[PDB]
């Protein structure tokens, strides 16, 4: 006979898979395959999940024709099954580590690159079995959900081609640690001390991100995780944004969108060593999807956008500021 069973180092060599995740492979090994059997949904089923899940059409048709078949790809399938596992084992803990496994390397398949596409409409069935127990409505659970196609997006604008490179972040809505509650998003989270929070972040990016809907959220998420959550029991949201920076209001007069959403918001951090540049690229890519061009290429549309480029210009650079928000 000629046959080999999959293990940790056939699916290793079989995708071009780097010395080093070999241990994240062994470990994959001694976790099962799922008791619950991994099935991809496929054709029109397929085609309406994803839609449903805001993936942009383009990558949908690429994404439902490249899905793996357990008999076909016998590599890629031994990892999808152990990786959704990997995942589900934690659902609801968002103590453990973000872990959703490599990206696998890019000249194997359009498979390949829409690996954890694959993880995720896996995973989908079982996530939202979670919301359920948990009260939590549909609306909801799907709203939050939602973001695959945002990330989906994002990579193919980043990159010539189809992808989907985030999945440390899917882990969150996968686990059922994260809900989307109106324009916001907000994660459960303990410090390294014991302290329960929630984090705060913000989906779609770049888009209109406005005062009222900022304060409708912040409105919500107390409510929604002392119901769906008791114990827990968080009261404030931390979070990090070029949004923070200070140096924003030398610019910006107190009514400016950004500025009543910095409000919100008590600092806990000082501003940091001279010449750091860690918000350059998130105000940059918020403000005009950037890209790369030279600056003054760029769109003078608003104050924000007139402000963003006129620092830069002036060759000072942004800052990522840190603090926490107490929730009503």
Not at 147 to 175: C, F, P, S
Not at 200 to 222: I, M, T
Request: hydrophobic content about 40%; aromatic content about 10%; charged content about 25%.
């Amino acid at each position: 006979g000629s046959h080999m069973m999959m293990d940790p180092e056939t699916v290793r060599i079989a995708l071009g898979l780097e010395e080093r995740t070999a241990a994240w492979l062994t470990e994959l090994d001694e976790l099962g395959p799922p008791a619950e059997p991994v099935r991809l949904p496929r054709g029109e089923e397929a085609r309406d999940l994803l839609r449903r899940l805001e993936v942009p059409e383009l990558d949908a048709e690429e994404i439902v024709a490249a899905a793996p078949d357990p008999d076909r790809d016998p590599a890629l399938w031994w990892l999808l099954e152990r990786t959704h596992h990997a995942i589900v084992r934690h659902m609801g803990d968002h103590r453990a580590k973000p872990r959703g496994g490599p990206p696998l390397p890019y000249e194997g398949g359009a498979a390949a690159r829409y690996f954890h596409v694959y993880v995720f409409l896996a995973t989908v069935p079982a996530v939202r079995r979670f919301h359920a127990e948990r009260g939590i409505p549909d609306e909801v659970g799907w709203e939050t959900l939602t973001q695959l196609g945002e990330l989906v997006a994002i990579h193919r604008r980043k990159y010539g081609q189809g992808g989907m490179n985030m999945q440390w972040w899917t882990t969150y809505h996968l686990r059922g640690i994260l809900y989307r509650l109106g324009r916001l998003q907000f994660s459960l989270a303990t410090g390294k001390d014991g302290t329960p929070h929630l984090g705060l972040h913000v989906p779609e990016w770049g888009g209109p991100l406005l005062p009222k809907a900022y304060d409708e959220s912040l409105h919500r998420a107390r409510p929604f995780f002392d119901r769906h959550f008791p114990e827990h029991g968080a009261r404030v949201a931390w979070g990090s944004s070029w949004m923070l920076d200070p140096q924003l209001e030398e610019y910006l007069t107190e009514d400016s969108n950004i500025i009543q959403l910095a409000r919100f918001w008590t600092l806990t951090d000082s501003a940091p060593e001279p010449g750091n540049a860690d918000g350059d690229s998130s105000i940059l890519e918020f403000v005009f999807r950037y890209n790369g061009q030279p600056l003054d290429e760029l769109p003078q549309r608003s104050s924000l956008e007139r402000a963003v480029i006129a620092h830069l210009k002036a060759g000072r650079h942004w800052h990522m500021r840190t603090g926490f928000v107490k929730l009503p």
